[PDB]
Design a protein around this ligand. Structure first.
Ligand SMILES: CC(=O)N[C@H]1[C@@H](OP(=O)(O)OP(=O)(O)OC[C@H]2O[C@@H](n3ccc(=O)[nH]c3=O)[C@H](O)[C@@H]2O)O[C@H](C(=O)O)[C@@H](O)[C@@H]1NC(C)=O
Ligand SMILES: CC(=O)N[C@H]1[C@@H](OP(=O)(O)OP(=O)(O)OC[C@H]2O[C@@H](n3ccc(=O)[nH]c3=O)[C@H](O)[C@@H]2O)O[C@H](C(=O)O)[C@@H](O)[C@@H]1NC(C)=O
Ligand SMILES: CC(=O)N[C@H]1[C@@H](OP(=O)(O)OP(=O)(O)OC[C@H]2O[C@@H](n3ccc(=O)[nH]c3=O)[C@H](O)[C@@H]2O)O[C@H](CO)[C@@H](O)[C@@H]1O
Ligand SMILES: CC(=O)N[C@H]1[C@@H](OP(=O)(O)OP(=O)(O)OC[C@H]2O[C@@H](n3ccc(=O)[nH]c3=O)[C@H](O)[C@@H]2O)O[C@H](CO)[C@@H](O)[C@@H]1O
Ligand SMILES: [Cl-]
Ligand SMILES: [Cl-]
Lengths: 371, 360
């Protein structure tokens, strides 16, 4: 035996529930699965369950079948989170992992953190420390409580680091690693370029359209806010075609509120896969969204962005002038704002790291040691 | 115009706090209170006895959730509490202390955008293994109003970036309760008579922290320490059912027969035992304050406490359970001590301060 023979396994269990969590997990899981002395276990809470919200990401992003599908979703915050909490705990007692990874800030994120910390299993938070400072948002609650329940905090931004320090989280548990969604954009771009012909199937050409997505509860749960958004987009479409993959939350609200006819006024799609989405974003003249990740991706592709919200967690994008908030207060103004910004670019700047946040995270999990 | 306050209570120390605050809210103009009992504590001697002897109004809801894991108790409470909130739509949800019930109620509420107010906010053990440290950090960070009992708790909240306009130093509602119920206790408690004890003729012990009961070696040290003490001065020991169950589980039941072990007692009986003890040994949060209220020296069987002013003032002493004999001696040696004269925890109107803030 010449070389040193290591005898130590760590079991890392990831908890995912929703579309953006599968994307982040695809970047991180792949590095962990390739890491010596790492056994990864993946739990799918069931929060997102339609194939174009879940299965399609497992296919295109090459994620192994979850070890557990919990089958929980569609309910209230109370039912989803409550049921996930108890179910995730069951798994934890079975699998007895050394670390629990949770991602972003869905109800699934919070359920996993809570299930784990009370069993004294160390929680690590991928995308830690983002603040909208708007507690009406369920996502803000989620990230605050998850962060304060975590033993490791993988911040993507300096602002995120500052947020955590300001809430008394000790500096030694915080690591600025950048953003794994940039890793993912880099890792899957060639496959998107190879495999999507969404542009060919919509008869669209590069820079000849605007891409839009809207699903924030505060935008969809209010009939008249939603109307401002659908009406604005419809106005924009007369000037530049608007492509709009429509989230199931958004469709369900549009329907119940009777606003369905507005979707005839733009190029509305079922929700798309990541590969088609990359191609759509890459080639847009402008992106209008209330998504977190999409704001970032627009910048990756150096496409201008409008965020239809009263705030963003991703403030560096505003400072760099790649992003611009426009709250949905009236349709005329929203539309005018969109058309004006279609002519803009931000400044050249390198945000979100080197595309290897996944490797940093894996390295930090493996070397923390038994406290 | 009128204001609706829904209160969530699960366990014994929450009933006691609720009693103080309830009496004042109910009596207050422009206020309905709805009371939700999660079911976390359910034995008659941990729950009904408090409603009855403290004349707490019947809970509008009894969820009947208890006896399971953290994840079962909390996740079920979360769903069940939310259901009631959807029905009642209060202006404020009120939580107390730091049980699994506390967290479920806060979390149920904040996702419905109902303002949450934390009664007894900002206490910190800095021991993140305690399920109660997590409960309070998360509850505090989910709350809109923070009723701190001490300057330390104010400081703890500011250091975690919680804004000062949300923090009110109101003292301790458990002081209110002690003052209000003191006379009834005097009139109605016959527990000294029943147990054959004389005033200042025994030590009072309670023990129930998870780190003391789930850990066999810690639990053994404690029970062994108390049995040694009892040889010198009788030890009176109302045993938390968790503690009873863990002691039976680890085969330490016999130590309970070597002191004056009791089932858990009512508040009135407890006040009488506390008042008349030579010294109190506990790992309870509330009992360490109460010993101070009755100028009875306290020994706290833990590595830390949230109530650090009780150490500062020499009314309370830490004794971690490392060694049965070291613990027995520390207990016996603290018996004839006393702390300095100082007023902690306010004027006994913490509840009315609380009530005023809510109405305004
Ligand atoms: C506002 C907010 O809190 N957001 C949180 C939220 O994410 P988010 O708002 O980005 O959700 P979302 O837009 O559904 O997904 C985008 C992805 O879908 C792809 N995407 C989008 C549409 C589509 O049809 N196809 C497709 O592939 C896009 O290419 C893109 O890769 O949940 C996340 C999570 O917990 O992990 C948190 O990290 C977020 N926190 C932050 C701060 O961004
Ligand atoms: C350490 C810890 O986290 N503790 C938290 C915990 O309380 P605690 O540890 O005091 O539990 P506990 O000792 O059963 O009750 C004592 C009462 O029972 C009475 N008591 C006691 C024994 C008895 O037989 N009869 C009786 O009437 C006594 O007279 C006394 O009035 O739950 C509380 C809650 O969530 O509201 C938190 O505020 C506490 N946080 C703090 C910081 O003290
Ligand atoms: C509270 C929470 O965790 N919110 C997140 C959730 O929003 P999202 O709106 O998806 O939140 P939910 O998981 O509660 O789903 C809401 C509703 O969408 C419908 N539905 C959802 C999924 C599905 O596959 N099919 C379906 O029809 C159901 O009616 C369901 O009740 O995921 C988004 C990513 O896309 C995130 O940006 C949001 O932060
Ligand atoms: C996690 C949590 O919230 N812990 C609190 C809980 O501890 P406590 O130890 O009561 O915590 P639980 O509510 O989880 O109860 C633990 C176990 O005690 C037994 N049991 C409980 C209640 C009852 O009426 N009968 C019975 O037998 C059950 O086996 C139960 O499973 O209440 C204490 C008040 O006394 C508080 O100091 C603790 O902070
Ligand atoms: Cl979307
Ligand atoms: Cl007890």
């Amino acid at each position: 035996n010449l070389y040193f023979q290591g005898h130590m396994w760590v079991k890392i269990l990831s908890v995912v529930g929703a579309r953006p969590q599968f994307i982040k997990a695809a970047a991180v899981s792949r590095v962990l699965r390739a890491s010596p002395g790492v056994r990864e276990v993946l739990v799918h809470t069931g929060q997102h369950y339609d194939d174009n919200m879940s299965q399609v990401f497992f296919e295109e992003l090459e994620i192994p079948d979850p070890d557990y599908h919990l089958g929980i979703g569609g309910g209230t915050h109370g039912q989803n989170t409550g049921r996930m909490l108890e179910a995730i705990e069951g798994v934890l007692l079975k699998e007895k992992p050394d670390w629990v990874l949770v991602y972003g800030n869905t109800d699934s994120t919070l359920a996993g953190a809570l299930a784990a910390v009370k069993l004294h299993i160390p929680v690590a938070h991928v995308e830690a420390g983002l603040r909208s400072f708007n507690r009406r948002m369920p996502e803000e609650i989620n990230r605050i409580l998850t962060d304060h329940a975590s033993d490791l905090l993988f911040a993507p931004t300096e602002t995120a680091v500052q947020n955590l320090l300001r809430e008394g989280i000790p500096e030694n548990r915080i690591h600025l690693v950048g953003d794994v969604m940039y890793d993912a954009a880099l890792h899957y771009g060639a496959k998107a370029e190879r495999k999507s012909r969404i542009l060919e199937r919509l008869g669209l050409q590069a820079k000849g359209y605007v891409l839009a997505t809207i699903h924030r509860a505060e935008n969809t749960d209010d009939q008249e806010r939603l109307r401002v958004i659908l009406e604005a987009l419809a106005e924009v479409h007369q000037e530049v075609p608007v492509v709009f993959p429509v989230h199931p939350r958004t469709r369900k609200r549009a329907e119940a509120f009777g606003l369905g006819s507005y979707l005839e006024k733009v190029v509305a799609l079922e929700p798309v896969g990541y590969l088609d989405m990359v191609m759509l974003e890459k080639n847009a003249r402008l992106i209008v969204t209330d998504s977190g990740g999409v704001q970032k991706e627009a910048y990756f592709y150096r496409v201008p962005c409008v965020t239809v919200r009263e705030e963003t967690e991703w403030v560096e994008l505003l400072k760099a002038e790649w992003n611009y908030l426009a709250a949905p207060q009236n349709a005329k103004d929203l539309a005018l704002t969109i058309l004006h910004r279609m002519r803009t670019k931000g400044v050249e700047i390198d945000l979100y790291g080197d595309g290897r946040a996944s490797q940093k995270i894996s390295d930090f999990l493996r070397k923390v040691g038994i406290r």
